[PDB]
Amino acid sequence: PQVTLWQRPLVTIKIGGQLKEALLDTGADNTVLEEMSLPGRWKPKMIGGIGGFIKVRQYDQILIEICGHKAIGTVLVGPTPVNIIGRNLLTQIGMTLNFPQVTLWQRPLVTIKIGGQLKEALLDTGADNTVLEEMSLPGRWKPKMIGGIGGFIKVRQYDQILIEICGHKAIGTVLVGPTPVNIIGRNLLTQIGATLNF
Ligand SMILES: Cc1c(O)cccc1C(=O)N[C@@H](CSc1ccccc1)[C@H](O)CN1C[C@H]2CCCC[C@H]2C[C@H]1C(=O)NC(C)(C)C
């Protein structure tokens, strides 16, 4: 299965005897599931996203069958609004990002050029939008608000912005705000021909 990114990359997963839909998320280090019944021991953990932090129950060595491929690893359970499969499990199912091929044992970071400036950014199949840390951009913007796993942040929305992502040019909407990492989301990933393969 090669997966393009014009829509959210959702898969069916089977975990703890239950069927769920989950988001293949190259932008997430961890795997976080909405509140669900999981058996066994767990440890309290705290995880941050765009917007702040949530408390989660951490379960180790959990079997999960992702789109018909089995993996065992750590699953976090908490107040996430989308089930997300993060890199700790994506690597186990041989997931790659293609546009160069990119494995997922490390964060898929790329160099971008935008508004004359060079930045590092995360290729994030779990993000609908592109969000960049505070930076000087030219032109008008529109007040906007985006939600992450931790809640919401205020961003400035800039439309039809030119970005060169790993030497491929795209034009699209970029959001600017208090994100801790520069995020290249699906609105731009599609333009550089990014696919998810496993
Ligand atoms: C879930 C997770 C981890 O377990 C570990 C590290 C980060 C994250 C995490 O939340 N990553 C996010 C990118 S934002 C980010 C923030 C800090 C570091 C790296 C990425 C996801 O990849 C995308 N993330 C997946 C998903 C998270 C729960 C809320 C609904 C979406 C929201 C979406 C998102 O945030 N979209 C933006 C437009 C705001 C970028």
Short mmCIF file of C-alpha atoms and ligand atoms in Angstrom, two decimals:
data_model
loop_
_atom_site.label_atom_id
_atom_site.label_comp_id
_atom_site.label_asym_id
_atom_site.label_seq_id
_atom_site.Cartn_x
_atom_site.Cartn_y
_atom_site.Cartn_z
CA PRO A 1 0.00 0.00 0.00
CA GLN A 2 1.34 3.33 -1.18
CA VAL A 3 -0.59 6.20 0.40
CA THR A 4 -0.94 9.67 -1.11
CA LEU A 5 -1.86 12.58 1.16
CA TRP A 6 -4.78 14.44 -0.46
CA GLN A 7 -6.90 13.05 2.40
CA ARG A 8 -5.90 12.11 5.94
CA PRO A 9 -3.92 8.82 5.90
CA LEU A 10 -6.31 6.77 8.01
CA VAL A 11 -5.94 3.02 8.59
CA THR A 12 -7.92 0.38 10.44
CA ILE A 13 -6.11 -0.95 13.49
CA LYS A 14 -6.90 -3.86 15.78
CA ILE A 15 -5.71 -3.39 19.35
CA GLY A 16 -6.80 -5.12 22.54
CA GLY A 17 -9.49 -7.07 20.67
CA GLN A 18 -11.05 -3.83 19.37
CA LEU A 19 -11.22 -2.22 15.92
CA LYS A 20 -10.33 1.46 15.57
CA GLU A 21 -9.41 3.92 12.87
CA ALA A 22 -6.10 5.72 13.30
CA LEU A 23 -4.00 8.40 11.62
CA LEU A 24 -0.56 7.50 10.21
CA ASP A 25 1.38 10.43 11.65
CA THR A 26 5.03 10.95 10.67
CA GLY A 27 4.96 14.06 12.88
CA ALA A 28 4.32 12.08 16.07
CA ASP A 29 7.12 10.38 17.99
CA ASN A 30 4.61 8.30 19.95
CA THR A 31 1.35 6.44 19.39
CA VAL A 32 -1.62 7.95 21.21
CA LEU A 33 -5.08 6.42 21.32
CA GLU A 34 -8.34 7.89 22.55
CA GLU A 35 -9.59 6.54 25.86
CA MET A 36 -10.08 2.81 25.47
CA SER A 37 -9.95 -0.42 27.44
CA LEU A 38 -6.41 -1.79 27.57
CA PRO A 39 -5.33 -4.61 29.90
CA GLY A 40 -2.33 -4.69 32.18
CA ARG A 41 0.12 -2.37 33.92
CA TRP A 42 0.62 1.27 32.94
CA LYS A 43 2.63 4.32 33.96
CA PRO A 44 1.58 7.99 34.00
CA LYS A 45 3.13 10.16 31.32
CA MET A 46 2.81 13.68 29.95
CA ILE A 47 3.00 14.50 26.24
CA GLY A 48 3.02 17.86 24.50
CA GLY A 49 1.64 18.82 21.12
CA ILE A 50 0.72 22.10 19.44
CA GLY A 51 -1.35 23.85 22.08
CA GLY A 52 -0.01 22.30 25.25
CA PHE A 53 0.03 18.99 27.07
CA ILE A 54 -2.24 16.08 28.00
CA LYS A 55 -1.87 13.34 30.60
CA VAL A 56 -1.84 9.80 29.21
CA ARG A 57 -1.58 6.25 30.46
CA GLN A 58 1.50 4.55 29.00
CA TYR A 59 1.26 0.84 28.10
CA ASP A 60 4.36 -1.04 26.99
CA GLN A 61 4.73 -4.04 24.67
CA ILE A 62 1.19 -3.72 23.28
CA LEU A 63 0.35 -5.72 20.17
CA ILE A 64 -1.31 -3.66 17.45
CA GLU A 65 -2.29 -4.77 13.95
CA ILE A 66 -2.03 -1.72 11.68
CA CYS A 67 -3.59 -2.13 8.25
CA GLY A 68 -2.92 -5.89 8.51
CA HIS A 69 0.69 -5.58 9.68
CA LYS A 70 1.55 -6.53 13.25
CA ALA A 71 3.68 -4.39 15.59
CA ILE A 72 4.46 -4.49 19.31
CA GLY A 73 5.32 -1.32 21.15
CA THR A 74 4.35 1.40 23.56
CA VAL A 75 0.84 2.80 23.28
CA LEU A 76 -0.32 5.95 25.10
CA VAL A 77 -3.98 6.28 26.05
CA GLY A 78 -5.52 9.65 26.81
CA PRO A 79 -7.64 12.66 25.78
CA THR A 80 -6.55 12.77 22.17
CA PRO A 81 -9.33 13.59 19.66
CA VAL A 82 -7.79 11.40 16.94
CA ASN A 83 -6.12 8.03 17.30
CA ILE A 84 -2.62 8.52 15.93
CA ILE A 85 0.02 5.96 14.94
CA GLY A 86 3.42 7.53 15.57
CA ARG A 87 6.92 6.69 14.39
CA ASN A 88 7.59 4.17 17.19
CA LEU A 89 5.09 1.91 15.41
CA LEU A 90 5.38 3.18 11.82
CA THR A 91 8.98 1.95 11.67
CA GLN A 92 7.79 -1.49 12.75
CA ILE A 93 5.54 -1.80 9.69
CA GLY A 94 8.26 -0.58 7.30
CA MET A 95 6.60 2.78 6.67
CA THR A 96 8.44 5.19 4.35
CA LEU A 97 7.95 8.76 3.16
CA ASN A 98 8.53 9.11 -0.61
CA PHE A 99 8.93 12.20 -2.78
CA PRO A 100 14.22 10.72 -2.04
CA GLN A 101 12.82 7.97 0.13
CA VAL A 102 12.67 8.62 3.86
CA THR A 103 12.53 5.96 6.54
CA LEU A 104 11.12 6.98 9.91
CA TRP A 105 13.62 5.85 12.54
CA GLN A 106 14.43 9.53 13.04
CA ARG A 107 12.17 12.55 12.68
CA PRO A 108 11.74 13.29 8.94
CA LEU A 109 13.29 16.76 8.92
CA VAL A 110 13.95 18.76 5.76
CA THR A 111 15.46 22.11 4.96
CA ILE A 112 12.99 24.65 3.61
CA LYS A 113 13.43 28.09 2.13
CA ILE A 114 10.61 30.54 2.75
CA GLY A 115 10.43 34.31 2.76
CA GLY A 116 14.13 34.38 1.84
CA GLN A 117 15.03 32.45 5.02
CA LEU A 118 16.30 28.91 5.60
CA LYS A 119 14.57 26.75 8.18
CA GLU A 120 14.33 23.14 9.27
CA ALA A 121 10.86 21.60 9.21
CA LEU A 122 9.09 18.33 9.98
CA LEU A 123 7.32 16.36 7.24
CA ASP A 124 4.07 15.69 9.08
CA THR A 125 1.43 13.44 7.51
CA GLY A 126 -0.69 13.96 10.61
CA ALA A 127 -1.05 17.74 10.07
CA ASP A 128 -3.67 19.17 7.74
CA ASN A 129 -1.88 22.54 7.72
CA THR A 130 1.63 23.97 7.59
CA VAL A 131 2.60 25.80 10.79
CA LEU A 132 5.89 27.65 11.20
CA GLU A 133 7.42 29.16 14.33
CA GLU A 134 7.45 32.93 14.67
CA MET A 135 9.14 34.34 11.59
CA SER A 136 9.11 37.45 9.44
CA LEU A 137 6.88 36.95 6.39
CA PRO A 138 5.74 39.64 3.93
CA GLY A 139 2.14 40.55 3.08
CA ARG A 140 -1.24 40.51 4.77
CA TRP A 141 -2.52 37.73 7.01
CA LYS A 142 -5.80 36.64 8.60
CA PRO A 143 -6.39 35.79 12.29
CA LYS A 144 -6.77 32.03 12.70
CA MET A 145 -6.82 29.38 15.42
CA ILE A 146 -5.58 25.78 15.16
CA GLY A 147 -6.03 22.86 17.51
CA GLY A 148 -3.41 20.30 18.39
CA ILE A 149 -3.20 17.51 20.93
CA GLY A 150 -2.68 20.01 23.73
CA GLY A 151 -5.42 22.44 22.84
CA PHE A 152 -5.25 25.49 20.58
CA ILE A 153 -2.82 28.21 19.50
CA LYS A 154 -3.34 31.56 17.79
CA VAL A 155 -1.67 31.76 14.38
CA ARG A 156 -1.40 34.25 11.54
CA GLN A 157 -2.64 32.81 8.26
CA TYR A 158 -0.65 33.72 5.12
CA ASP A 159 -2.00 32.59 1.77
CA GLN A 160 -0.23 31.67 -1.48
CA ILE A 161 3.26 31.59 0.05
CA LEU A 162 6.17 30.11 -1.89
CA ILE A 163 8.17 27.41 -0.07
CA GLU A 164 11.05 25.32 -1.37
CA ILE A 165 10.87 22.03 0.56
CA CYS A 166 13.92 19.87 0.00
CA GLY A 167 14.48 21.56 -3.36
CA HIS A 168 10.91 21.15 -4.57
CA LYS A 169 8.79 24.28 -4.94
CA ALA A 170 5.23 24.59 -3.61
CA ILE A 171 2.81 27.50 -3.15
CA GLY A 172 0.19 27.41 -0.46
CA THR A 173 -1.15 28.60 2.86
CA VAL A 174 1.34 28.87 5.71
CA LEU A 175 0.34 29.50 9.33
CA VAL A 176 2.72 31.36 11.64
CA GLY A 177 2.52 31.02 15.39
CA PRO A 178 3.86 29.64 18.67
CA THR A 179 4.61 26.12 17.50
CA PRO A 180 7.74 24.49 18.99
CA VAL A 181 8.61 22.87 15.63
CA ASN A 182 8.14 23.97 12.03
CA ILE A 183 5.51 21.64 10.49
CA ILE A 184 5.05 20.87 6.78
CA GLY A 185 1.49 19.58 6.56
CA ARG A 186 -0.54 17.82 3.90
CA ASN A 187 -1.60 21.02 2.11
CA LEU A 188 2.04 21.27 0.99
CA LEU A 189 3.14 17.62 1.13
CA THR A 190 0.79 16.82 -1.76
CA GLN A 191 2.45 19.43 -3.98
CA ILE A 192 5.90 17.91 -3.58
CA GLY A 193 4.48 14.44 -4.38
CA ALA A 194 4.90 12.95 -0.91
CA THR A 195 3.59 9.42 -0.46
CA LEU A 196 3.37 7.10 2.53
CA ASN A 197 4.56 3.59 1.61
CA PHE A 198 4.51 0.37 3.67
C1 LIG B 1 1.41 13.22 19.31
C2 LIG B 1 2.86 13.73 19.43
C3 LIG B 1 3.81 13.00 20.11
O1 LIG B 1 3.45 11.77 20.69
C4 LIG B 1 5.13 13.47 20.21
C5 LIG B 1 5.48 14.69 19.64
C6 LIG B 1 4.52 15.43 18.95
C7 LIG B 1 3.21 14.95 18.87
C8 LIG B 1 2.15 15.79 18.09
O2 LIG B 1 1.16 16.25 18.59
N1 LIG B 1 2.46 16.03 16.66
C9 LIG B 1 1.56 16.79 15.81
C10 LIG B 1 2.41 17.81 15.05
S1 LIG B 1 2.86 19.20 16.18
C11 LIG B 1 4.45 18.82 17.07
C12 LIG B 1 4.68 19.39 18.31
C13 LIG B 1 5.86 19.12 19.00
C14 LIG B 1 6.80 18.26 18.42
C15 LIG B 1 6.57 17.69 17.17
C16 LIG B 1 5.39 17.97 16.49
C17 LIG B 1 0.95 15.77 14.86
O3 LIG B 1 1.91 15.19 14.08
C18 LIG B 1 -0.17 16.46 13.99
N2 LIG B 1 -1.38 16.50 14.86
C19 LIG B 1 -2.01 15.11 14.91
C20 LIG B 1 -3.33 15.14 15.73
C21 LIG B 1 -2.93 15.37 17.23
C22 LIG B 1 -4.18 15.50 18.15
C23 LIG B 1 -5.12 16.60 17.66
C24 LIG B 1 -5.55 16.32 16.22
C25 LIG B 1 -4.30 16.20 15.26
C26 LIG B 1 -3.64 17.58 15.19
C27 LIG B 1 -2.34 17.53 14.35
C28 LIG B 1 -1.67 18.88 14.45
O4 LIG B 1 -0.99 19.12 15.38
N3 LIG B 1 -1.92 19.84 13.35
C29 LIG B 1 -1.33 21.16 13.32
C30 LIG B 1 -1.90 21.92 12.07
C31 LIG B 1 -1.69 21.98 14.63
C32 LIG B 1 0.21 20.96 13.12
#
